[PDB]
């Protein structure tokens, strides 16, 4: 005897993914080390090395993600993540969106999109001092994700019915990694002492990151109204408005970046806003719609904010700059009030607060958005071209045009604000196209105008739906109450339908002539979760309107109903569509 008998360890998805996250951690660790030596002692052979490791770090990250997709497709049940997330396992589209379903797979997809964005920024045309430092901080973020994926929270150990629970996560993860690369440049810029050049080289990641943020927030609104179906587009609970804080700051930052992009002004506020917006997007992406991983993310957040504002610490009035800076102050003040209100029950040792703070601040940004671009750059005082009458005229028109109907001073003043805003969009377009010719060539101005108008339409829609909504909860056998809000319904039974994993039950209703005839709102005894009854609502859109139909409890042989009535919520989503087809127009169609 005495001749050894070797075996392989057979190549699982498990050890492919383990070599994936470990090899990615190794590549990103030595990328952070070679980038830091490249800044400190100034040698070119280390800025070559950190730029050499961007492609292998992303490749090992892709190996780990494709190992998780591999395991989810081959129906290996030995790993903990797949055995706990193939308790919703069968269809093809949900097996490909299970690799970010719970926590560990989602931080794998998060670190993957980080590595992809670092790869796409690694071919930078950037001078080597802050090239070494952007690689240092971006490899640090990758090292945090794969460290927090490797020592804690590993995917490779041993629920619903809608697709937006797939695509609302990635929309923010993309958004975060977009706001990664300006922040990197900023923490580079304040250390490389070149304070203006950083934001005009990084501008498209800032716009695209904010576009992914705005599509995420509007998509979460639509999904919470129509598919999660608790009769509302917005929640002020500490999970939901925590994805409202980053979107606010990434908006203020977008406007300040544009100012210095065109003027070299507020580089101080730009550094502040990209640091605050980036760490905000971190803590918003960690705590979206869903132990000791929270401590690691809290330490990472503290590190990010402390680093950016520490390096900023070591380093006109009535104009378009003043209007944009006051608007960015309004955005930052709004995020400040939402954070200061969220922790105001925490730090002592509701929805009326947030609504009553949001309506004046929303009125202020909807006013400033109209008045700002109609101002010239760096003016002393508003004495010459006071065009502000006709805007005020439109403003005044809308208020009386609403006040001479039912509309309360909130709703009628919001009508005045939208009419003032469409007036400003026309005044901007008229004073733009008068140069004579295709104004559509100037993609920033015309796409921004479409985007500005789209928010204008949402301010009207939100104030009209917030003011004018009625809910009624009834219980009908073949009727108890029939007319609510313009159409009379009646009860016609329950059906049972089996489509799968969930059994569905029905309330079939009836309406006359052009009232929506025979509708069918839904309910699930959904077997997978602790036998709960969640609803999915049915809703007719109308020419002025949206009508939401709810089940509440379907009882044993008689059932209940809820019907809520809101105005202009469909026009809120046509405004969301207008924002999508405008921010795409800032890019190339
Ligand atoms: C010019 C600017 C350039 C700057 C670029 C540099 C960037 C560097 C990268 C930044 C990363 C920041 C990471 C800070 C987070 C640390 C937070 C610690 C978390 C923690 O202690 O968790 C506890 C222990 O868990 C545990 O059991 C241990 C968990 C440890 C997780 C750590 C994850 C590793 C992340 C990699 C960090 C980077 C390393 C540096 C190369 C909780 O549990 P408990 O004990 O309280 O339970 C209670 C029972 N009593
Ligand atoms: C319903 C599902 C929802 C899924 C949403 C998917 C989003 C659609 C993606 C469309 C684009 C995909 C194909 C185009 C490939 C383009 C890659 C290069 C992009 C690029 O070069 O842009 C740089 C910026 O990068 C950037 O700003 C970031 C580029 C990243 C593109 C978006 C990545 C999406 C990844 C999602 C994968 C899952 C989809 C699988 C079906 C330019 O910068 P610059 O240097 O020129 O600026 C200089 C300033 N002076
Ligand atoms: C699946 C759901 C996703 C919905 C998206 C709907 C539209 C899908 C297709 C988008 C195609 C847009 C054009 C893609 C071109 C990719 C090729 C790269 C070309 C390139 O590098 O040019 C850049 C354009 O930005 C870019 O690279 C554009 C990247 C494309 C992603 C942009 C979408 C994010 C914003 C819209 C939000 C809606 C998302 C809804 C989920 C920079 O320009 P430059 O070099 O000329 O700069 C200097 C001037 N000074
Ligand atoms: C200088 C030369 C002289 C010119 C003259 C100067 C005149 C200045 C005029 C400017 C005055 C600004 C006044 C703004 C008041 C807010 C009106 C809208 C409020 C509203 O929505 O209706 C409320 C009820 O809505 C509700 O119950 C829930 C509302 C939820 C908040 C609404 C969110 C709106 C956000 C809009 C989004 C904008 C786009 C964001 C990107 C009314 O109820 P109330 O009377 O009880 O209120 C009392 C709070 N103290
Ligand atoms: C605080 C009030 C606001 C003011 C004064 C304002 C002003 C401006 C200005 C001057 C521009 C440059 C193009 C132009 O001159 O039209 C611009 C661009 C833009 N704005 Fe606004 N804005 C405001 C609020 C908002 C809001 C609420 C949104 C969100 C819908 C928004 C989204 C955008 C976008 C996406 C661009 C294009 C930026 C680019 O990629 O170049 N702004 N804004
Ligand atoms: C482009 C992005 C811009 C986004 C702008 C949005 C900022 C302002 C947010 C306004 C919306 C807040 O609206 C919020 O809606 C929810 C859900 O409908 C309301 O919640 C409501 O739901 C229940 C449902 O039973 C009702 O019985 C109850 O009377 C009421 O509280 C909140 O009380 C209100 O605060
Ligand atoms: C010198 C003053 C200058 C300001 C000019 C104001 C113009 C005058 C506008 C008054 C017209 C509004 O008239 C009003 O209309 C509708 C029609 O049913 C009803 O509507 C009323 O209901 C609600 C009840 O909460 C009020 O909040 C609302 O503001 C009001 O419009 C009132 O019964 C009637 O008083």
């Amino acid at each position: 005897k005495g001749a050894e008998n070797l075996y392989f360890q057979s190549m699982t998805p498990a050890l492919l993914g383990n070599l994936g996250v470990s090899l990615a951690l190794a590549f990103s660790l030595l990328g952070l080390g070679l980038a830091l030596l490249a800044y400190l002692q100034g040698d070119g052979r280390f800025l070559r090395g950190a730029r050499a490791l961007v492609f292998p770090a992303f490749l090992a990250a892709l190996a780990a993600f494709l190992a998780l997709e591999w395991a989810l497709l081959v129906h290996d049940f030995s790993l903990a993540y797949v055995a706990r997330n193939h308790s919703t396992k069968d269809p093809l589209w949900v097996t490909l969106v299970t690799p970010w379903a719970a926590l560990e797979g989602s931080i794998l997809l998060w670190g993957l999109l980080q590595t992809l964005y670092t790869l796409l920024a690694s071919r930078k045309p950037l001078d080597p001092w802050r090239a070494s430092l952007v690689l240092a901080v971006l490899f640090g973020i990758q090292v945090f994700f794969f460290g927090v994926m490797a020592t804690i929270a590993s995917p490779f150990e041993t629920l619903q019915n809608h697709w937006m629970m797939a695509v609302h996560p990635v929309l923010m993860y993309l958004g975060f990694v977009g706001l990664s690369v300006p922040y990197a440049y900023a923490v580079a810029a304040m250390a490389t002492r070149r304070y203006q050049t950083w934001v005009e080289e990084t501008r498209w990641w800032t716009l695209i990151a904010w576009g992914f943020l705005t599509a995420g927030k509007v998509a979460g609104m639509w999904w919470s109204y129509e598919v999660l179906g608790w009769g509302g587009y917005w929640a002020w609970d500490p999970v939901e408005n925590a994805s409202f804080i980053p979107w606010l700051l990434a908006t203020a930052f977008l406007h300040t970046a544009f100012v210095q992009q065109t003027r070299g002004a507020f580089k101080t506020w730009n550094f502040a806003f990209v640091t605050l917006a980036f760490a905000a997007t971190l803590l918003g992406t960690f705590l979206t719609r869903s132990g000791p991983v929270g401590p690691a993310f809290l330490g990472f957040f503290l590190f990010a904010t402390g680093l950016g504002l520490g390096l900023l610490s070591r380093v006109h009035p009535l104009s378009r700059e003043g209007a944009l800076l006051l608007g960015a102050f309004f955005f930052a003040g709004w995020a400040l009030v939402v954070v200061l209100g969220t922790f105001y029950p925490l730090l002592v040792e509701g929805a009326p607060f947030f609504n009553q703070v949001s309506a004046p601040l929303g009125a202020g940004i909807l006013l400033l958005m109209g008045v700002g671009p109609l101002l010239p750059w760096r003016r002393a005082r508003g004495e010459v071209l006071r065009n502000l009458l006709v805007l005020l005229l439109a403003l005044a028109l809308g208020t009386l045009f609403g006040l001479l109907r039912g509309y309360t001073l909130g709703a009628s003043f919001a009508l005045g604000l939208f009419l003032y805003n469409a007036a400003a969009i026309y005044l901007l377009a008229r004073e733009g196209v008068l140069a004579r010719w295709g104004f559509l060539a100037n993609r920033r101005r015309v796409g921004s105008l479409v985007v500005h108008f789209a928010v204008a339409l949402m301010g009207l829609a939100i104030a009209f739906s917030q003011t004018y909504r009625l809910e009624s909860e009834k219980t009908l056998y073949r009727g108890e109450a029939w007319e609510v809000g313009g159409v009379r319904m009646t009860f016609q039974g329950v059906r049972a339908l089996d489509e799968g994993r969930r059994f569905a039950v029905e309330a079939l209703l009836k309406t006359d002539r052009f009232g929506e005839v025979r509708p069918r709102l839904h309910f699930y005894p959904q077997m997978n979760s602790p036998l709960p009854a969640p609803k999915v609502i049915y809703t007719p859109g109308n020419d002025y309107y949206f009508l939401l139909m709810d089940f509440d409890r379907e009882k044993g042989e008689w059932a209940s109903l809820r019907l809520i009535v809101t105005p202009l919520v469909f026009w809120m989503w046509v405004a969301g569509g207008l924002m999508a087809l405008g921010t795409l127009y800032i890019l190339w169609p």
Side-chain angles (χ1 to χ4, degrees), residues 31-345:
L32 178 272
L34 293 184
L36 272 193
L37 263 49
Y39 177 74
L40 284 207
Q41 263 134 10
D43 211 333
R45 300 135 169 146
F46 302 141
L47 188 269
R48 302 164 45 233
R51 286 193 183 173
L53 301 148
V54 279
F55 204 65
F58 159 75
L59 275 173
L62 180 155
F65 186 82
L66 284 207
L68 206 40
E69 290 240 319
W70 188 324
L72 269 157
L73 257 60
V74 300
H75 312 315
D76 191 350
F77 265 43
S78 67
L79 313 151
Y81 185 57
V82 54
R84 264 193 304 294
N85 282 305
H86 263 236
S87 298
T88 315
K89 104 196 191 207
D90 270 285
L92 190 56
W93 78 268
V94 81
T95 47
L96 301 138
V97 309
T98 308
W100 61 88
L103 186 155
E104 308 94 44
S106 56
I107 49 150
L108 178 43
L109 186 274
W110 199 352
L112 186 133
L113 295 190
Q114 251 286 338
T115 53
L116 159 78
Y117 267 56
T118 308
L119 183 55
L120 296 176
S122 100
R123 45 178 253 182
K124 46 170 148 316
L126 186 81
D127 57 72
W129 290 253
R130 66 210 230 279
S132 83
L133 257 198
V134 292
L135 293 198
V137 51
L138 290 188
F139 276 126
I141 294 168
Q142 296 183 197
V143 154
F144 177 63
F145 279 139
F146 283 94
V148 84
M149 206 182 315
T151 175
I152 218 178
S154 156
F156 312 109
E157 244 202 299
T158 309
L159 181 279
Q160 32 63 23
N161 59 269
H162 196 74
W163 32 282
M164 193 142 291
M165 208 192 281
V167 313
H168 181 277
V170 198
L171 256 288
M172 271 174 232
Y173 292 167
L174 286 175
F176 166 84
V177 304
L179 276 200
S180 83
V181 47
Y183 166 80
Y185 268 82
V187 175
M190 288 161 326
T192 311
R193 298 127 195 157
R194 295 192 220 104
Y195 305 107
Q196 144 74 23
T197 184
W198 71 281
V199 78
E200 28 179 28
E201 313 157 309
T202 197
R203 162 260 194 297
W204 286 126
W205 285 272
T206 72
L207 174 67
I208 273 165
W210 181 91
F212 281 133
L213 259 59
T214 194
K217 194 36 60 196
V218 178
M221 265 170 134
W222 168 85
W223 172 30
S224 163
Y225 194 74
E226 189 163 293
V227 197
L228 193 271
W230 268 105
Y233 43 76
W234 198 270
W236 283 122
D237 65 60
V239 172
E240 288 292 331
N241 64 351
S243 321
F244 185 42
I245 292 119
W247 178 84
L248 283 173
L249 302 157
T251 300
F253 167 55
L254 200 169
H255 287 50
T256 73
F258 167 70
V259 166
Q260 95 181 58
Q261 280 172 35
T262 42
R263 203 120 197 127
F266 332 109
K267 51 210 72 203
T268 305
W269 288 119
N270 261 309
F271 286 141
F273 281 151
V274 65
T275 304
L276 285 169
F278 165 73
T281 307
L282 170 76
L283 218 33
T285 40
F286 156 73
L287 272 167
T288 37
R289 284 191 210 284
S290 39
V293 55
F297 270 88
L298 180 137
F300 187 44
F301 173 84
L302 277 178
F303 176 82
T305 36
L307 160 70
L309 302 191
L311 300 186
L312 178 123
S313 147
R314 68 160 183 107
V315 73
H316 88 298
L318 205 89
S319 303
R320 180 189 292 164
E321 296 112 302
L324 292 212
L325 193 280
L326 188 48
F329 260 119
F330 270 37
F331 278 118
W334 197 350
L336 182 49
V337 172
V338 170
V339 157
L340 191 147
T342 285
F343 292 154
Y344 164 68

